[PDB]
């Protein structure tokens, strides 16, 4: 219920790699609105399928409305992507390929087994259903927008991109890379303000100046979480990419994802940063 009231500030809570040790969960996913999907649960299959779409469409409109509010009611790259990330998570939950499976999520899955059954090809039927309903789900998420631009809404966010099917880990890595480049500049700035330069003619500030040492410890903690998050996500990517058809348009390594989502991406520099051996870090936080 609370998930359908107020979305926490972006990056207020960091990715959680402690619940399921093999996966790293974004706060957005934890807050994914599934009120109706949870509180649900005759013979006719096609009927329940429709009763399902009804509740999903409403949850989608609420989710979309809240993401718009989280974005301070601005139509921009950031809004359109949160819509993608959340649309996809719905898709996986529907297709039984979600990696979270916590608390009320387990319930939602039970209700889905109660609708599509548990037989062999039941999974196939859940895939086709979604592949037939998604464009309407996306439209439902765009309700608050469509409510105001009345038809021009389709020129804000690209439909053909949102509805495109992608493994969950794929999308999460994009979202994570996006969060990483947002945080890095801030964290590095904090560091410079207190650690830039020497304390005498030969020794770096970090050698004696406590405020700097405090800053360096903070950074260490931050970059260490990033290092751990990437490790988990990228290894999950390989794992999942070794257990499916895994034929994607120009995606071989998890780095190729970042190369698509980020500007002038440089993996050598990226690995230097998360392993505390980049030029900035050595200069500021290493006494020798």
């Amino acid at each position: 219920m609370k998930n359908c009231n107020y979305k926490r500030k972006r990056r207020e809570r960091d990715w959680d790699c402690n619940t399921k040790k093999d996966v790293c969960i974004p706060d957005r996913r934890y807050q994914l609105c599934m009120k109706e999907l949870t509180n649900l649960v005759h013979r006719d299959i096609t009927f329940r399928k429709l009763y399902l779409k009804r509740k999903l469409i409403y949850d989608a409109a609420v989710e979309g409305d809240l993401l718009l509010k989280l974005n301070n009611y601005r139509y921009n790259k950031d809004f359109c992507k949160d819509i993608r990330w959340s649309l996809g998570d719905f898709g996986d939950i529907i297709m039984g390929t979600d990696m979270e499976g916590i608390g009320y999520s387990k319930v939602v899955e039970n209700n889905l087994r109660s609708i599509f059954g548990t037989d062999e090809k039941a999974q196939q039927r859940r895939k086709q259903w979604w592949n037939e309903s998604k464009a309407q789900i996306w439209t439902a998420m765009m309700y608050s927008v469509k409510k105001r631009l009345k038809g021009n809404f389709i020129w804000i966010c690209k439909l053909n991109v949102a509805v495109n099917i992608e493994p969950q880990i794929y999308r999460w890595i994009r979202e994570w890379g996006r969060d990483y480049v947002s945080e890095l500049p801030t964290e590095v700035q904090k560091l410079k303000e207190k650690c830039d330069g020497k304390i005498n003619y030969t020794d770096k500030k970090v050698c004696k100046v406590p405020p700097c040492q405090n800053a360096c410890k903070s950074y260490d903690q931050w970059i260490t979480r990033k290092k751990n998050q990437w490790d988990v996500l990228s290894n999950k990517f390989i794992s999942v990419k070794n257990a499916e058809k895994v034929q994607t348009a120009g995606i071989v390594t998890p780095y190729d994802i970042l190369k698509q989502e980020l500007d002038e991406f440089n993996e050598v520099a990226f690995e230097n940063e998360i392993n505390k051996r980049d030029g900035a870090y050595i200069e500021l936080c290493v006494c020798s």
């Binding site: 469409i57 409403y58 609420v62 309407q136 309700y143 469509k146 409510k147």
Partner: peptide, 12 residues
């Protein structure tokens, strides 16, 4: 604070 029916109708 969201009219369910209008959301449903708009979805089509």
């Amino acid at each position: 604070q969201l009219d369910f029916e209008d959301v449903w109708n708009s979805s089509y």
